[PDB]
Each structure stands twice: as structure tokens, then as C-alpha cells.
Amino acid sequence: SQISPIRDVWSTNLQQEMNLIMSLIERYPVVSMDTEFPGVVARPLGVFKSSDDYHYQTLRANVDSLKIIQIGLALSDEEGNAPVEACTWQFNFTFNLQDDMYAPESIELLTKSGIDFKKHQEVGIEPADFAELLIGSGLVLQEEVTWITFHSGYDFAYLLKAMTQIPLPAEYEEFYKILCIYFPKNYDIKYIMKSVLNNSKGLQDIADDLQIHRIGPQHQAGSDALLTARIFFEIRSRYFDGSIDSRMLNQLYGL
């Protein structure tokens, strides 16, 4: 194939690329997702309702405060085939190294991983513009579409933040309720692999183990989302004989 496996999206081609995605989603209704963001800059203080509560209050504090940098969406059909048009889309969001908050370590990691911060400052997408398109796209609010993620608390929180444009709910129970309306059918591969199957490996280590090859750069959301899709179908085949167990629906790792 002579076209790009990873389609990059900027403010200049947002509408075109969303139009392409909208035209494909009915035929390729399995969406795998990842996000990149500027890390964690703080831990909230006090003592907490649990341990997951502490995890949720950490997430909420940082996701509310730190701007999204990339979202990766990889479409597949129900047997794992990607559209020939694109193995994955990578949405690149507006960010300003001089003005915005971030963990310096994360910016360095993203830079080494290939993020063009100057270009994100110049033609990065506004999350709000993306969110209007995403909500009307057919990908969310639809039981017909399955979302696939990995260790997904922050990743899903960033998408909910984009769509709602307001601070996240104060308690996990409320976050979970609203999340399951926008993403009514989702699987977290980390929950499946570690919490159910007692395999603690990370995304890349699972792919290496299963001999699944990565296309694109590690630690970029497009490539990470595509690897997520490929691991999902291989796990479904190897440990679920083709049919994922319904007890794993909508369970997020660590929350």
C-alpha cells in the first residue's frame, strides 16, 4: 500500500478527516483509542474514600488542569480488519510550551517520541471543535460501536473533558455513569489482561509477547491506538475463542 497507515489530523483537515471516519464507522464499528497528554504534575493531598478513590481524585486533578496533546482512533471491523484508507487516525491538539502547564519529563518523552510541538502550537486542533464533530459522528452514544482501550482512566477522562468542556465529576460514580452513556460498550484490555487473566504486562510488552508488530512510533497516540486494536483481537481469539466475555464490559482498570 502506498498511502499513509497513520493519518495525521490538524485544525486544517479536521473536518475532512472526521467526514472520512463518519463514512467508515458503520462498516468498521470497533474503535481503539489512546491519548497523549503532559503527564501528572501533582498528587492531591489528604486521605481518601479508598484506593481507587485516590486514583480517581489524582486523575481528576490532572486531567482537568492539563491540556490534551493527541488522540488516536483506530477503526476495525468486528473481525479485526482495518479500513484500507487508514490503519489509524492521529488527532493533534493545540498546545503552547511557553504558556501551558505540564510535567517537563513528559514533554521531553513526547519530543523524543516525535511530537512536533511547534506545529501543535500553530495548527493544533481546538478540543472543542473536535468534540462537536465527535459527538455527532456516530462513534459515541451508540451501542453499535465498541470502544477498546488500555489502562484507560486518563484516556477516557480526556475524551469526556473534550466533549463536555467542564471540570470532571467530583466522584467516580458520577464519572462512570456519564462515561457509560457516551461509550456504552467498551473494553479495557488492561482490566482484561491483569484483573481477569493475571497478566500484568504493559501494552508494548504484550504485543512483543504475542508477536504483534507495531506500525508507527511508540508513545504516539495513533500508533498506540492501532497496537491496542491488534492486541484486542488477538486476546479475543486466544483466550475467549472469538467471543469476549460480557463480564468485562465497561470495567476500567484501577477504578
CB of 203 to Mg ion, least distance (A): 8
The answer to whether 122 is a known ligand-binding residue is no
For residue 97, give the 3-state DSSP assignment. Answer: coil
Site string for Mg ion, 161-180 (x = CB under 5 A): --------------------
152-to-27, 86, 160, 179 alpha-carbon distances in Å = 25, 23, 12, 12
The answer to whether 224 is a known ligand-binding residue is yes
Considering beta carbons, is residue 48 or 212 the nearer one to Mg ion?
212
CB of 228 to Mg ion, least distance (A): 8
Rounded Cα distance between 149 and 74, Å, is: 11
Considering beta carbons, is residue 94 or 149 the nearer one to Mg ion?
149
CB of 155 to Mg ion, least distance (A): 5
Buried b (16+ CB within 10 A) or exposed e, 11-32: beebeebbebbeebbeebbbbb
Of 99, 32, 101, 115, nearest in space to 63 by CA: 101
Q: State yes or no: residue 188 binds Mg ion (CB under 5 A).
A: no
The size of the interface with Mg ion (CB under 5 A), counted in residues, is 3
User: Binding site: which residues?
Assistant: 34, 36, 155, 224
Which stretches of the chain bind Mg ion, using CB under 5 A?
34, 155, 224
User: Binding site for Mg(2+): which residues?
Assistant: 34, 36, 155, 224
